[PDB]
Design a binder for this molecule. Sequence first.
Ligand SMILES: *[C@@H]1O[C@H](CO[C@@H]2O[C@@H](C)[C@@H](O)[C@@H](O)[C@@H]2O)[C@@H](O[C@@H]2O[C@H](CO)[C@@H](O[C@@H]3O[C@H](CO)[C@@H](O)[C@H](O)[C@@H]3O)[C@H](O)[C@H]2NC(C)=O)[C@H](O)[C@H]1NC(C)=O
Ligand SMILES: *[C@@H]1O[C@H](CO)[C@@H](O)[C@H](O)[C@H]1NC(C)=O
Lengths: 50, 49
Amino acid sequence: VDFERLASIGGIKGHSKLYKIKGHPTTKDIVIKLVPNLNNLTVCSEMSID
Amino acid sequence: GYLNLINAVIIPISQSLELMRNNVKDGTPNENIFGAIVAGAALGIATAA
Ligand SMILES: *[C@@H]1O[C@H](CO[C@@H]2O[C@@H](C)[C@@H](O)[C@@H](O)[C@@H]2O)[C@@H](O[C@@H]2O[C@H](CO)[C@@H](O[C@@H]3O[C@H](CO)[C@@H](O)[C@H](O)[C@@H]3O)[C@H](O)[C@H]2NC(C)=O)[C@H](O)[C@H]1NC(C)=O
Ligand SMILES: *[C@@H]1O[C@H](CO)[C@@H](O)[C@H](O)[C@H]1NC(C)=O
């Protein structure tokens, strides 16, 4: 690409950056519990869990 | 004496196996399988097995 005639047409050469994209597919596994565990609330909770 | 006798036949197998691990390198050029990769110069002459 010629920047002199591109400056004549009205374009100015900006910054130059890289394309350091994607990578190794190393994995990991987690557990998502949904029901919260109440232990102090054994006195007054009724059956609102149901 | 038993230890001195077995140390002559314990060490070079260990050296050979760590050289086998040194011939391989966990690398990945571009969209590779992210593994294998051995150097052709560091292995010399070898078969498929
Ligand atoms: C098996 O590989 C290990 C690890 O070295 C890595 O793999 C090699 C195949 C090369 O690609 C290395 O660039 C790469 O790091 C080798 O162990 C290394 O041995 C060298 C000597 O051969 C050690 O260097 C010494 O380190 C200290 C510096 O204070 C001084 O005693 C010496 O001046 C000398 O430089 C080096 O520390 C050591 N470890 C690492 C992590 O590089 C190993 O030699 C190689 N092959 C065999 C046959 O065992
Ligand atoms: C509240 O729960 C915690 C954690 O299980 C326990 O240590 C504590 O004794 C409980 N307190 C009461 C008042 O039940």
